[PDB]
Amino acid sequence: PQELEAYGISDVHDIVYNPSYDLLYQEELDPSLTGYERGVLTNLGAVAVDTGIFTGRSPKDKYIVRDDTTRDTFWWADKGKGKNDNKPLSPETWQHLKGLVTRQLSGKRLFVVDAFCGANPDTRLSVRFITEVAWQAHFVKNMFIRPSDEELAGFKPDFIVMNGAKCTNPQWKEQGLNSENFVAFNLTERMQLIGGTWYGGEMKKGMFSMMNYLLPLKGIASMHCSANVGEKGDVAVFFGLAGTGKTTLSTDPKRRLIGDDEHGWDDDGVFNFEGGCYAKTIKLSKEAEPEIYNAIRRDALLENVTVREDGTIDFDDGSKTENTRVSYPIYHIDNIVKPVSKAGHATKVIFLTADAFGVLPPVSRLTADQTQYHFLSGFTAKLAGTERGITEPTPTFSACFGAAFLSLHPTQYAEVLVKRMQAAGAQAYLVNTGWNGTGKRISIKDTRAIIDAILNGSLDNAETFTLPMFNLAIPTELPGVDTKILDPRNTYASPEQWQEKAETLAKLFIDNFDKYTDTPAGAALVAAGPKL
Numbered sequence: 001p002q003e004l005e006a007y008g009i010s011d012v013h014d015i016v017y018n019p020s021y022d023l024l025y026q027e028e029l030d031p032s033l034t035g036y037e038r039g040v041l042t043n044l045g046a047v048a049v050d051t052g053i054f055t056g057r058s059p060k061d062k063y064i065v066r067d068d069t070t071r072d073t074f075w076w077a078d079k080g081k082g083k084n085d086n087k088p089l090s091p092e093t094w095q096h097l098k099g100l101v102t103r104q105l106s107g108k109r110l111f112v113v114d115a116f117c118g119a120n121p122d123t124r125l126s127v128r129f130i131t132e133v134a135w136q137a138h139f140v141k142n143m144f145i146r147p148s149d150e151e152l153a154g155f156k157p158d159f160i161v162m163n164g165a166k167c168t169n170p171q172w173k174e175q176g177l178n179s180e181n182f183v184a185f186n187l188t189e190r191m192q193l194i195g196g197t198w199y200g201g202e203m204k205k206g207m208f209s210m211m212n213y214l215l216p217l218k219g220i221a222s223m224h225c226s227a228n229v230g231e232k233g234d235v236a237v238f239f240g241l242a243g244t245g246k247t248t249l250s251t252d253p254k255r256r257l258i259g260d261d262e263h264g265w266d267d268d269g270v271f272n273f274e275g276g277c278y279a280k281t282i283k284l285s286k287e288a289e290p291e292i293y294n295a296i297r298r299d300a301l302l303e304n305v306t307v308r309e310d311g312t313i314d315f316d317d318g319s320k321t322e323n324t325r326v327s328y329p330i331y332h333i334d335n336i337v338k339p340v341s342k343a344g345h346a347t348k349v350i351f352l353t354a355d356a357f358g359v360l361p362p363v364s365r366l367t368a369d370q371t372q373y374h375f376l377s378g379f380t381a382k383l384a385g386t387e388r389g390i391t392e393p394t395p396t397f398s399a400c401f402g403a404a405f406l407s408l409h410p411t412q413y414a415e416v417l418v419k420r421m422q423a424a425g426a427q428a429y430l431v432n433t434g435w436n437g438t439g440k441r442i443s444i445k446d447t448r449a450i451i452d453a454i455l456n457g458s459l460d461n462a463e464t465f466t467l468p469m470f471n472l473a474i475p476t477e478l479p480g481v482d483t484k485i486l487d488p489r490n491t492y493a494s495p496e497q498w499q500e501k502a503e504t505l506a507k508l509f510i511d512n513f514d515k516y517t518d519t520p521a522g523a524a525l526v527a528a529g530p531k532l
């Protein structure tokens, strides 16, 4: 307990260190629990919980302490270098938030989970997570790397994550913060503090943000991508924003899964940060996604799904949130890289996007300059009007396909990615997992056959022609793929109807890209973007 007292947490009478899966099951199903701690047992064998008022991350509540360690290296929200959520925090307000959390956890029954972030000993974080909520401990047991008993014996944390979801900050107005909630990081004390939000993804993406700070400064790419590997050792990575297909499409029975969301790329190859996968379950189809569906069993942890009185799950019900999720340890997938989630250098780099404007082609091979342009652009889009019965799509441009998690400037991630790709001779591709002129999403079946064709070389050998405006090389046909869909003009009444939309989208790309054109490298990439 005095070790806990070193963190500021007093008088803990009941300490649960390294809780087993069986204990976490017992704790969640305790009929005496109240409120959002409670779990419910589903007919699939997995416990389901509700994560409370927050059912996704709260970027507006994300703060990073600005001090002499971070001042000149962080990509700060206020430093005129493009928009981001790295809002500066004073060390004095940090101490206030730390007092809130440590007092909240003092005198409680605490779960302590030691885990690694990063598959390689030379660059991993040794993270100690502290929570008073059993399903939060379970989330981190699933999603981080579980140490061996030997690693546990000599465990030396170099980052502490203290989850005080049950406390809030009443001084937030005087302190200039956004709300009574907070997700704060301190790189001098090497700690994350959480208040107000119970959502487990803050811890997952928080540690991801810290890897995104430390690794590129050591020459190692740090990537919002999934990754898998063929029997020959050929590695693919799949970038993309939330919901664009990284987890869906890397979970592929023809490939060994490396990881689904967070990877590094060092001198030896591509390596997972995590010990689990965090899948979306909205409208989950057992036929369309059988491996992910099969992972939903005891020790998986369902979030915010609708569970019927009889224990069945209504996966289509988005009432609590569209962001229904399940975490599971990665070995709930049958065909994975083991015992360590890593492989060689990627030779296929796939940018996933869900184009709600219905303009981009299902697949295209990128030039080198197009790769850089679209990596910095980081496009996807949403049908935001759907619940009001309207389409109009809303663009998101998020640098590196994950600006919410970037702690350095986008160009620093671009430069090390390009360096790794060039050394490996990797080829890049752009895949629209989103919409076309039918006003419907491309089927998962068609997208998987597109991925197959990328990975087995058939797309590279295909005859291609250039789609106008975006100047994207697209194939005339592909094995097992519906041929009509390959040219996005074919799903509209006429190519001119596609063109009206392509022009709308091109202007959005051009306007977004302008902020990168204040270096000569950036200005020169304009020629690789869409052209009116």
Ligand SMILES: Nc1ncnc2c1ncn2[C@@H]1O[C@H](COP(=O)(O)OP(=O)(O)OP(=O)(O)O)[C@@H](O)[C@H]1O
Binding pocket: 240, 241, 242, 243, 244, 245, 246, 247, 248, 249, 260, 261, 278, 279, 280, 281, 282, 284, 433, 434, 441, 442, 443, 444, 445, 447
């Ligand atoms: N053609 C398609 N390709 C891929 N996914 C599709 C397709 N059509 C529908 N989907 C659905 O879109 C979602 C893809 O989400 P997925 O979990 O792969 O996102 P992600 O990129 O892993 O995001 P995150 O980083 O937030 O975890 C799933 O709900 C999937 O069923």
Ligand SMILES: [Mn+2]
Binding pocket: 246, 247, 248, 260, 261, 278, 279, 280
């Ligand atoms: Mn995912």
Ligand SMILES: [Mn+2]
Binding pocket: 224, 242, 261
């Ligand atoms: Mn993600």
